[PDB]
A paper describes a structure:
Here, the current status of the fully automated ambient-temperature beamline VMXi at Diamond Light Source is described, and a highly efficient pipeline from protein sample to final multi-crystal data analysis and structure determination is shown. The VMXi beamline and its associated PXF within the Research Complex at Harwell offer a highly automated pipeline where researchers provide a suitable protein sample that is used for robotic crystallization, monitoring and subsequent in situ data collection from crystals in crystallization plates or in thin-film sample delivery systems. Here we present illustrative examples of data measured using VMXi from a variety of proteins comprising both conventional crystallographic standards and ‘real world’ user samples. Routine RT data collection provides a useful capability that is highly relevant to studying protein dynamics and ligand binding without the complication of cryo-cooling.
As an example, here we show a project that focused on a range of nutrient-uptake proteins isolated from a marine cyano­bacteria (Synechococcus MITS9220). Once pure protein was available for a number of these proteins, they were put through crystallization screens en masse in the PXF, and subsequently potential crystallization hits were identified and analysed by data collection at VMXi. The overall fold of the two MITS9220_PhnD1 structures with phosphate is very similar, with a root mean squared deviation (RMSD) of 0.15 Å. The availability of the two structures in complex with phosphate provided an opportunity to directly compare the ligand binding site and understand if temperature bias potentially led to any differences in the ligand-binding interactions. Within the crystal structure of MITS9220_PhnD1 RT structure, the four phosphate oxygens are stabilized by ten direct hydrogen bonds with main-chain or side-chain atoms of Tyr44, Ser124, Thr125, Ser126, His156, Asp203 and Tyr204, as well as a water molecule buried deep within the cavity. Given the similarity of the 3D fold of the two MITS9220_PhnD1 structures, unsurprisingly, all four oxygen atoms of the phosphate moiety in the MITS9220_PhnD1 cryo-structure showed an identical hydrogen-bond network [Fig. 3(a)]. Thus, no temperature bias was introduced at the global or local scale for the MITS9220_PhnD1 protein. Even though the average B factors for the main/side chain and the solvent are higher for the RT MITS9220_PhnD1 structure compared with the cryo MITS9220_PhnD1 structure, overall, the two structures depict identical dynamic motion and flexibility trends.
Author numbering: -2 to 272
């Protein structure tokens, strides 16, 4: 192009878009200052749109969940995994219940049978922490979504929306991203009288940065490495970096290898999300 190259950063829309606009707009400015290239945050309206925009080149660098990042990489030969938060290596879901539902804390996976007959909400259909891994753990206890009230699960579309519909009593129970839950409790965004945690899943890997191939052709030899180092270099030294790391609820970003997503890919194929 006679136009100078711009890096398009995206993220799955996993929470309130106002909070994501603040986070990714601050991050785009931080990456822009560290790389000396124009960086823009481009929002998408749902999880699949992030996969699709990445596959077709509408996004260059995307904050994906486990399932969406595995999908994006399988459909985009040469895409690479750059980084994840410290917390993404040992991620969990919380199962939450409205305190009028009569659900008690569960002490084992086998106790998930208590959710039979209950109005249950997942997050996005494509969510690792909000759908895929919760559905996986439910299946191990012998619970399938057909056994919920109405013969199916709700899909709220986001971790924030799962808290909202359980808190409101529209659903009795749901599952979501533990970091979003913990940040919501700490911020006063959830009424802990109305909503409580009844179970935490075992650990799995979840969020990661995925980058399109051939960025070095657009931005120059070494750019992809410099981009990775910029993410890995984020540190709570300036107000802007403190804000980014606060909103990610991370102390740092760390390297990650594609091979650590093999278990997520397997669950995705078992539950029919990956063809
Ligand atoms: Cl460009
Ligand atoms: Cl552009
Ligand atoms: Cl795929
Ligand atoms: Cl689905
Ligand atoms: Cl089912
Ligand atoms: Cl369902
Ligand atoms: Cl439903
Ligand atoms: Cl290249
Ligand atoms: Cl840097």
């Amino acid at each position: 192009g006679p136009m100078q190259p711009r890096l398009k950063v995206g993220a799955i829309p996993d929470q309130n878009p106002e909070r994501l606009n603040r986070l990714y707009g601050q991050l785009a400015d931080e990456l822009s200052d560290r790389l000396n290239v124009k960086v823009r945050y481009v929002p998408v309206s749902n999880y699949p749109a992030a996969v699709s925009a990445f596959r077709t080149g509408g996004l260059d660098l995307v904050w994906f969940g486990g399932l969406t990042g595995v999908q994006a990489r399988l459909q985009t030969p040469g895409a690479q995994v750059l980084a994840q938060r410290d917390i993404d290596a040992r991620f969990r879901s919380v199962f939450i219940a409205n305190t009028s539902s009569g659900l008690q804390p569960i002490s084992s996976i086998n106790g998930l049978t208590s959710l039979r007959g209950k109005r249950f909400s997942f997050g996005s259909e494509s969510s690792t922490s909000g759908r895929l891994m919760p559905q996986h753990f439910l299946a191990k206890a012998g619970v399938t979504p057909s056994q919920f009230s109405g013969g199916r699960a709700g899909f709220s579309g986001s971790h924030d929306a799962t808290i909202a519909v359980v808190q409101s009593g529209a659903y009795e129970a749901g599952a979501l991203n533990e970091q979003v839950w913990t940040s919501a409790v700490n911020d006063g965004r959830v009424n802990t009288e109305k909503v409580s945690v009844i179970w935490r899943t075992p650990e799995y890997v979840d969020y990661h940065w995925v980058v399109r191939p051939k960025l070095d052709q657009r931005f120059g030899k070494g750019f992809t490495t410099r981009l990775q180092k910029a993410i890995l270099g984020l540190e709570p030294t300036t107000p802007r970096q403190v804000t980014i790391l606060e909103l990610f609820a991370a102390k740092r970003f760390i390297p990650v290898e594609a091979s650590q997503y093999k278990p997520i890919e397997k669950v995705g194929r078992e539950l029919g999300k990956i063809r």
